[PDB]
Amino acid sequence: SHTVKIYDTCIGCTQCVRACPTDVLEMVPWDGCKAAQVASSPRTEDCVGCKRCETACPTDFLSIRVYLGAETTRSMGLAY
Amino acid sequence: KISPVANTGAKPPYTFRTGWALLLLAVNFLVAAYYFHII
Amino acid sequence: QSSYLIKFISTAPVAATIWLTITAGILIEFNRFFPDLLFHPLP
Amino acid sequence: KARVIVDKDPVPTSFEKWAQPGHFDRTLARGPKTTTWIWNLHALAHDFDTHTSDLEDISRKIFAAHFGHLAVVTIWLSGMIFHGAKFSNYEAWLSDPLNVRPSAQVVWPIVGQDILNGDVGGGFHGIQITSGLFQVWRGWGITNSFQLYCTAIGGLVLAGLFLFAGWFHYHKRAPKLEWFQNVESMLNHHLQVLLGCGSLGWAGHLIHVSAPINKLMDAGVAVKDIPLPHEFILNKSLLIDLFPGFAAGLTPFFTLNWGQYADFLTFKGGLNPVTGGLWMTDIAHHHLAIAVVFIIAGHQYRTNWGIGHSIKEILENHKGPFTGEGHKGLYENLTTSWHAQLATNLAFLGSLTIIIAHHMYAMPPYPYLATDYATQLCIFTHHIWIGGFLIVGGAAHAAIFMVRDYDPVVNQNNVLDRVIRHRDAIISHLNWVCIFLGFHSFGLYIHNDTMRALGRPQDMFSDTAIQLQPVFAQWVQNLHTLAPGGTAPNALEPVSYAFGGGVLAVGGKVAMMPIALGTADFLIHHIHAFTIHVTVLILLKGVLFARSSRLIPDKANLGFRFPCDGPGRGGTCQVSGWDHVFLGLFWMYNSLSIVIFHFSWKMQSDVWGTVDAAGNVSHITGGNFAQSAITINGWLRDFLWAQASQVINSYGSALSAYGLMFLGAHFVWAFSLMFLFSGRGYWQELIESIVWAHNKLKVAPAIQPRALSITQGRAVGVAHYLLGGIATTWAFFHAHILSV
Amino acid sequence: VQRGSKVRILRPESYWFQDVGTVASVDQSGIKYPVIVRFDKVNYAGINTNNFAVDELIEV
Amino acid sequence: LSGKTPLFAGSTGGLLTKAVEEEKYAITWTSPKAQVFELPTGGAATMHEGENLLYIARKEYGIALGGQLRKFKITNYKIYRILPSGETTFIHPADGVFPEKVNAGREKVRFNARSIGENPNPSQVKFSGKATYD
Amino acid sequence: GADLTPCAENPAFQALAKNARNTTADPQSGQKRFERYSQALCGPEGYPHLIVDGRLDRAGDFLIPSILFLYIAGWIGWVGRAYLQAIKKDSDTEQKEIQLDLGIALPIIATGFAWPAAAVKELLSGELTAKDSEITVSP
């Protein structure tokens, strides 16, 4: 399915997890001193690719990037 | 930061650029001289 | 106050409208008296 | 319980807000950081629902906004009447209406406009109008210019009163909300006074002023000899000579001896032979009958005295077996949301404007309209196009209500709630009808277009070959011919000569004629039904799925107007209720563009044309509609290619401007495709590289440039697409008929 | 770089690349991209701020 | 799964044969009060006093519904994934804490220590099965 | 030219002068138009064909109108550029573009008649252009 990649420029807004409709994302802690918050993509099978996460990311350019790929019943949002 | 987006390595006069340009300009004046029957 | 009214003309549309009308009026003025021009006459 | 509450000095009248643009919203008020702020400043200007949540400020803004709008319409109508006074040939048109063309515009002697001023008769060189105001002012009884001058001044005065009112009712004297919510008082007042008494007064005008004036002018009396309207009131001998019913006076009215007024109140039900137009006496009997009906109809609702209905009671009691709670909760919707009221008022008003166009051509209600083929088409076309736009707006605001103002608590198992539940069944079946009609209605043209090319006319769906006769319409036609003396015993003639009767010839031209329905008309009426159903499919789907969909469950939080939700789920593009409206407008165009061509070709072919004294009619195209309108090539050959000859050859004549705008309209239509096909992703990249050149030369702008938004690019396209589309037919219809 | 200083950003794949900007503050910690910067020109999303590293910045 | 279905007469927008054949999801929640709420796909329904249950064709319908319930001040919403063999799993709050808030048990998944700007050029990676974003 | 002759020898031009089609309110505008048009060369169709070759004899066709535009056009661009750079120094720059501070603009609009003289000064110096490293460019 699709792949959501999260890069070093995260700052811990948490907005990506909120805008997501499918709960593909989760905020995890960082062992480092940067912050106690990093975005993750644990369940990418439910990613549909609506790019709402990329609309809520206030970086110079996207810390969290969604790369489209192979399709499935879930990623296409087909209730039939 | 691999490739610089701006070019470098040229001096104010730009001799090599100007020499070929003035030559191309001279042919145009020559064809014009043939058009006006100056030659 | 009068200052508030001047800024309304200072805005883009009212300023653009008055200027282009003055600009257009000059051309319509010139084409009236001097009817048709395609080239400058040659002395 | 319908009191008049008015607040005192709600808002000041300072000029300071003019200085600061963006006072609408907190976002726009901050500043213009980018160029999208400029486009957003306009797209939200009349969106009062976004500015303030307080419903009072919404209604006060709207009530004052209508007043400024009426000032515009009154200034417009006054200008038409003013142009009729100074720059017009109306006074010459009255003496010789048939052989003189109507004109009201004069271009100035400058670079070469002056060719547009053409000989239209009456010693006047000007543009030939097609609005029909000359026929209107004649029906009103205006016989000189000064009398026409005074009416223009009153409109400007009336315009100022409307303009003064909105200031008065927004700055000084603002009504509260519950003053607006008294809908029961609103309906009584509008029905009885605006529509009832307004019609009643016009009956007094037609009886006193118009009908005697029209009768004298029709009987050969010169305009100089016709008395003025005031003289009829003072001297009653004049009315008695024309209408002897006045000799009895008002006593027969109160004693119910209404037969005495049979002279000037009639049911002739036909057109005046001398002037193509309905009898003024019927128009007098007309408005008198309707005023009583409207005045009666208004008293239904309660309005503080206990006598009448609560509309809530009528709706709630109209439930049934298949609809659980019925109309319970709707009255709260119409009273809560302005958008829902707009959707109803705009949709049905649009359908009126189409119905009006249909009644007017078959029943010309003004003198000398039928002979003026130019005025009939332009009126029939303009009204259909207006009604088409309004009907589409009704679906838009229906969706805006559903996104913003729809409450699930109120609409709980009501009629609206059930429709949303089985929205799938409504659309899947409507989809089947659209495919069924499109195959049959249009595929039959392809079969005829194919068979004729193969050389098999025996197999066409034609009048001589296999034929599809509209037997039901042929039958309903026949009843209206036999209704006079049958099911309409007091009717002398059929209601319209289009249904049947005999040919009516005003001068050399035919005013109206029976419209025989053949196989060609069978197909076209289904084409119209086909295009209308698809337009409903696009719009109705926009309303029901505006709130949610299987593809997008939460479509309301995104809003009514949003471009997409990402490239996920396949592609979620043009899923909003806005984008459905954007699509329906193209189909509204395709729906109505055939209507005006069906009217233009048939009337030219079957109805209109010069008639000989011996009884032979020579139509304009001569039966071209019967055999050629069953194939697409015929519409391309006999209608578009043939009738457009006057347009392209209009250069060097008074009609040359039509050939230009006919040509320039093709530009804007193609210019639309630049926006519809393309996309913002390209254009911001091009603006990027162009900004580099300005940053180089230090011409960079402070307001950073930004490409047009996605939905805006669709909005601009449909604007050009319809503007360049309609304007083409506008010049094609004008120049072809003004020459013919 | 110090507080209030104007700097040219050298990071590519950025909207304000090769453009000046004022340093609002610096995080005195071991975090990557500590320096906060504010520019006059907004980006496409309208953020008007972003954190950047010291190596990318040059003191104008 | 135990709960009362919200009372609504039915709607064409709902579960299809994909529910029985492939998978269906179910959302459960507890209420203080019986109220009216808009369903994820068309219509309105009257949620019961406590322990409500609803079967939804997709996971998006539930989280979309969960946002609506939060506006009614209900945060004890739970989603399940029901397979045709009856298998049920606690899908959305796999950890009891919500995804927005932090928990120690979680770990990084698909993290790139580099920046997007430092991605490798694709010409460096061709005829190898590798993608640039890895 | 291509079968191109002077006006008076051309028979086509003689006929078109009779069919005047007077443009302006002046009754003899049509005759005065064709009279002034005698200088240009007319083809077989009888319409004047301009020559933009650059001959001094026919500078009125394009060359004289050519210079008249560029002087006007540089006035517009130079005034726009100076007005824009002047705004950039002030505090609120965005609002000034929409709402024009005429106190700043009209002095700048007054200047511009000698736009080439001010242009060459910024041309010789680095005022006209900017460094490529200063400008933003995509990767």
Ligand code: CLA
């Ligand atoms: C007597 C003068 C006067 C003055 C000083 C004001 C002043 C004000 N009015 Mg007001 N108003 C007036 C008359 C006046 N009004 C009248 C006569 C009406 C009845 C129509 C209204 C109805 C009215 C409403 C309903 C509202 C205001 C509002 C306002 C405030 C903000 C207006 C603003 O910034 O936009 C200034 C806008 C303009 C100058 C543009 C106006 C465009 C006119 C009306 C239409 C032109 C149509 C034109 C023919 C179209 C051609 C198109 C084509 C040729 C291109 C401000 C205090 C608003 C307010 O209080 O905000 C909270 C508000 O909601 N007014």
Ligand code: CLA
């Ligand atoms: C009684 C009529 C009526 C009324 C009162 C409204 C009122 C409204 N509409 Mg609406 N609408 C109507 C009819 C009406 N509409 C019709 C008939 C259609 C179908 C075409 C629509 C389609 C429609 C859409 C699709 C949308 C609205 C929206 C809105 C709201 C905001 C619009 C706004 O900010 O205005 C400002 C609007 C503009 C500045 C657009 C200008 C369009 C120009 C006039 C087009 C050019 C036409 C012109 C004749 C061309 C020739 C001249 C030109 C060459 C110079 C507002 C409540 C918006 C909304 O979401 O509501 C909340 C929205 O998105 N309307």
Ligand code: CLA
């Ligand atoms: C000429 C161009 C054209 C055509 C043919 C169509 C056709 C269609 N559009 Mg459409 N559309 C168009 C342009 C066109 N569109 C444009 C430009 C837009 C943008 C505004 C849209 C926007 C649009 C929307 C928004 C909607 C449609 C819908 C429809 C469908 C209506 C159902 C119907 O008529 O039955 C099908 C009829 C035909 C295809 C007509 C010709 C068929 C012939 C008679 C049969 C072919 C002969 C034979 C079998 C061929 C066999 C060959 C063999 C060798 C394979 C239909 C598929 C609606 C829809 O899908 O609802 C069902 C809908 O909602 N369209």
Ligand code: CLA
């Ligand atoms: C889409 C509309 C349409 C229709 C209605 C027709 C109709 C016809 N075509 Mg034709 N055609 C069309 C489009 C159409 N054409 C197009 C688009 C082309 C171009 C490719 C052609 C090209 C063409 C050629 C080249 C020829 C025809 C011919 C014919 C005729 C013979 C049909 C035949 O043999 O099929 C037989 C039909 C069937 C076996 C099935 C019909 C389906 C039935 C009626 C369904 C009924 C459903 C029922 C009511 C529901 C039950 C409900 C339940 C509860 C009980 C007939 C008049 C022939 C001819 O010579 O014409 C005289 C011929 O040679 N056609």
Ligand SMILES: CC1=C(C/C=C(\C)CCC[C@H](C)CCC[C@H](C)CCCC(C)C)C(=O)c2ccccc2C1=O
């Ligand atoms: C061309 C195009 C653009 C770009 C269009 C733009 C940028 C239109 C710009 C219109 C005007 C000309 C901008 C400048 C307005 C100035 C105020 C005018 C100067 C003032 C004088 C005229 C007085 C899109 O953004 C787009 C988006 C989505 C789908 C298709 C398209 C599309 O086709």
Ligand code: SF4
């Ligand atoms: S930068 Fe993007 S991914 Fe990082 S916390 Fe903010 S919204 Fe989430």
Ligand code: SF4
């Ligand atoms: S594309 Fe959609 S599913 Fe994927 S992370 Fe963004 S919001 Fe979540």
